[PDB]
Write a protein that binds this ligand. Structure first.
Ligand SMILES: Cc1cc2nc3c(=O)[nH]c(=O)nc-3n(C[C@H](O)[C@H](O)[C@H](O)COP(=O)(O)OP(=O)(O)OC[C@H]3O[C@@H](n4cnc5c(N)ncnc54)[C@H](O)[C@@H]3O)c2cc1C
Ligand SMILES: C[S@@+](CC[C@H](N)C(=O)[O-])C[C@H]1O[C@@H](n2cnc3c(N)ncnc32)[C@H](O)[C@@H]1O
Ligand SMILES: [Cl-]
Length: 668
């Protein structure tokens, strides 16, 4: 034992569908995706009509409707639903139902090319089809979220085998699905996907009273779903087909609580105070406002992005890893989500998706790159680059190989934070600057916040998104986060340095010029356990010098000029395991008492001891531009008892009580 023999069976890319036309036909399955002339009206009859969506929409007593689907395929069901939802909202703008959520699972996703071709056969759907195509995700495993129409429609595509994926979903998703679209290839010649495990999962995820519909009337499917707990009914088939099936969950099933120590719970309340001013608090605000939360932001400073989020140019690429499975999945999916989110964001901020190139300057660095190169990632995520091609790619001669992230680049985090915050204010965010939270206590049924002035406010929900100062409250004092101060030097461009087309990562990082500035940013110093933001001359020199040590023959590297003493200093908040800390704020003392002997009383274990209606968005390290968007989704979903776009184990890797609970589990 102890060998890497497993690695040859692991895959970090999902493979696309083998498509042909005549209508899209699957080569692998020898079936059509849908029927030829009548595909659109059949879709409306089977999936919309069989779940009685038109009747239910105007009386639906929740602001969200959640449809879940087996087998996304062409997207026809999704597009047809969206169209119907849009028509519903126009006819009944006063209805409580304001937002659509669609969760689909897909083993063989279409390429962007095939998807665009499939959609050509339905010019009626083109306004919706085009928006889908604009965000169609890179085929990586697991959950991919697309905010469509500014969050009015949300699409979670889970890439992989549906029968592997269903047991990977978080508990939060149970009893949340209003309607099932049980699609797939005709049972009698894809029996493989129509399993009991599938039907049971559908039953688990179904809201009590929730529906399902399907095209087939195969006996074994009817009985399988009855055994899962749905009340099933035969209804007339569209066209030639004599019969289809629909069902209702007419009972309340026992709610699952495996791993209660990782329970992500939400809140019933809809007004929140956020303690922040940085990227995290900014993106969170958007995510909460689009759901009709009342949001108040408090910031200690005179203006926002004076914390760690205040640089002029930060790099955006994912931290990949061969050994940390959860770190790799998080950053890969956060990264591509971050790119879609930033593309869609109606806010001006200086950026350029010019690519990021990491360089093998060292034996130690070549080896970390080689580790990453030995995973089969899609080229669109990360791809090797020879030494000869590096100069063509980056613009500069580095004299060594590397790996490039072609969808990566730089953005201006200070401006992004300010302009997002300014958008949130137009959407209703109340900001109070020069409000430094000292304290908060539970009074009656509110959180009482005490600011440094004898100022007080009361709020229903409090979210701590205050960077390195996260652990300065008694209810947070024992979080395993630590401060890392650092300095990024601002440098003028030269003729040699104006040739840089990309962000270079080495023992440090160098951005290309911001053409509006004629300046690059180059960093960064790393001071573990320091909260000191004073300008350091040694750090400044060292930001130049590290670059020169990595590429000793590079005449462009010597043209870096730090003599202006221009720099920016901030304090990162990090964890040993490099993942964020996002979720309920855990009660340390109550965790330790309640899970004292957890190593042998797992079965009787209570829900994770947390503070009520108190959340945190924290520890973004030096990769917050990459991680904040998806973390904003996760937290705001969790807070709202809405579908979280991540698998259970990656969520557990992001839970704030994780260190304590890991030790307590193993008895230590
Ligand atoms: C040197 C350096 C280089 C970096 N390089 C990169 C990079 O290349 N790529 C990248 O993606 N990221 C980079 N980062 C940033 C990293 O992503 C940070 O972790 C990120 O900016 C964290 O943002 P935040 O919103 O969590 O916290 P912050 O930006 O630190 O914001 C904290 C906010 O909380 C407020 N606050 C604190 N205490 C209180 C209080 N008690 N009451 C009210 N308000 C309070 C502060 O006013 C502040 O506005 C870098 C950061 C540094 C310092
Ligand atoms: C009939 S198509 C789906 C319908 C789609 N909305 C359309 O109109 O084109 C069937 C889909 O099921 C998918 N599928 C088959 N087995 C699967 C599995 N085990 N997990 C996830 N998807 C699967 C296929 O990839 C295919 O995309
Ligand atoms: Cl930055």
């Amino acid at each position: 034992l102890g060998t890497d023999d497993d690695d040859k069976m692991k895959h970090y890319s999902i493979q696309p569908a083998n498509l042909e036309f005549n209508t899209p036909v699957s080569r692998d399955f020898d079936d059509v995706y849908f029927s030829n002339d009548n595909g659109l009206e059949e879709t409306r009859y089977v999936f919309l009509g069989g779940n009685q969506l038109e009747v239910r929409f105007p009386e639906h007593p929740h602001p969200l409707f959640v449809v879940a689907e087996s087998g996304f395929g062409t997207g026809l069901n999704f597009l047809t639903l969206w169209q119907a939802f849009d028509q519903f909202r126009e006819a009944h703008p006063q209805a409580q139902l304001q937002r659509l959520h669609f969760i689909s699972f897909e083993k063989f996703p279409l390429t962007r090319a095939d998807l665009a071709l499939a959609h050509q056969h339905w010019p009626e759907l083109a306004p919706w089809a085009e928006q889908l195509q604009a965000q169609w995700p890179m085929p990586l495993p697991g959950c991919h979220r697309l905010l469509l129409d500014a969050g009015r429609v949300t699409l979670d595509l889970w890439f992989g085998d549906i029968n592997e994926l269903t047991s990977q979903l978080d508990d939060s998703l149970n009893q949340k699905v209003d309607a099932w679209f049980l699609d797939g290839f005709a049972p009698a010649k894809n029996p493989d996907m129509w399993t009991q495990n599938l039907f049971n999962a559908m039953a688990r995820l179904a809201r009590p009273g929730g529906t399902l519909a399907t095209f087939t009337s195969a006996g074994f499917v009817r009985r399988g779903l009855q055994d899962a707990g749905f009340t099933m009914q035969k209804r007339k088939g569209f066209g030639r087909k004599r019969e289809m099936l629909c069902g209702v969950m007419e009972q309340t099933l026992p709610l699952p609580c495996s791993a209660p120590w990782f329970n992500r719970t939400g809140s019933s309340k809809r007004e929140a105070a956020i303690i922040g001013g940085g990227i995290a608090s900014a993106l969170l605000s958007l995510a909460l406002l689009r759901r009709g939360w009342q949001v108040t932001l408090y910031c200690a400073d005179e203006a926002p992005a004076l914390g760690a989020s205040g640089n002029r140019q930060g790099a955006l690429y994912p931290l990949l890893s061969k050994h940390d499975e959860a770190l790799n999945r998080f950053f890969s999916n956060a990264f591509t989500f971050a790119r879609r989110f930033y593309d869609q964001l109606p806010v001006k901020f200086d950026h350029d998706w010019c690519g990021v190139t990491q360089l093998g300057w060292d034996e130690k660095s070549q080896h970390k790159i080689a580790q990453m190169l030995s995973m089969d990632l899609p080229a669109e995520l990360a791809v090797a680059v020879e030494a000869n091609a590096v100069e063509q790619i980056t613009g500069v001669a580095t004299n060594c190989s590397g790996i490039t992230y072609p969808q990566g680049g730089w953005l201006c985090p200070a401006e992004l934070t300010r302009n997002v915050l300014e958008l949130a204010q137009q959407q209703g965010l109340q900001i109070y600057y020069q409000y430094q939270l000292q304290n908060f206590s539970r009074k009656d049924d509110c959180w009482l916040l005490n600011f440094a002035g004898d100022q007080q406010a009361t709020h229903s929900v409090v979210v701590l998104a205050n960077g390195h100062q996260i652990s300065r409250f008694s209810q947070t004092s024992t979080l395993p986060v630590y401060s890392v101060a650092g300095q990024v030097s601002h440098i003028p461009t030269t003729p040699e340095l104006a040739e840089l087309k990309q962000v270079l990562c080495y023992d440090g990082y160098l951005t290309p010029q911001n053409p509006a500035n004629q300046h690059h940013c180059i960093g960064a110093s790393y001071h573990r356990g320091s909260e000191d933001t004073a300008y350091s001359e040694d750090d400044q020199q060292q930001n130049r010098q590290r670059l020169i040590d990595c590429f000793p023959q590079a005449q462009w590297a010597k043209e870096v000029d730090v003599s202006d003493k221009e720099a920016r200093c901030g304090v990162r908040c990090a964890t040993r395991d490099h993942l964020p800390m996002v979720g309920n704020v855990p009660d340390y003392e109550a965790t330790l008492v309640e899970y004292a002997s957890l190593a042998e009383q797992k079965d009787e274990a209570v829900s994770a001891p947390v503070f009520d209606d108190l959340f945190m968005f924290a520890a973004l390290g030096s990769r917050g531009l990459c991680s904040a968007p998806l973390c904003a989704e996760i937290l705001a979903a969790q807070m709202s008892d809405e579908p979280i776009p991540m698998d259970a184990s990656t969520l557990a890797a992001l839970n704030p009580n994780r260190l304590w609970v890991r030790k307590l589990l193993k008895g230590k």
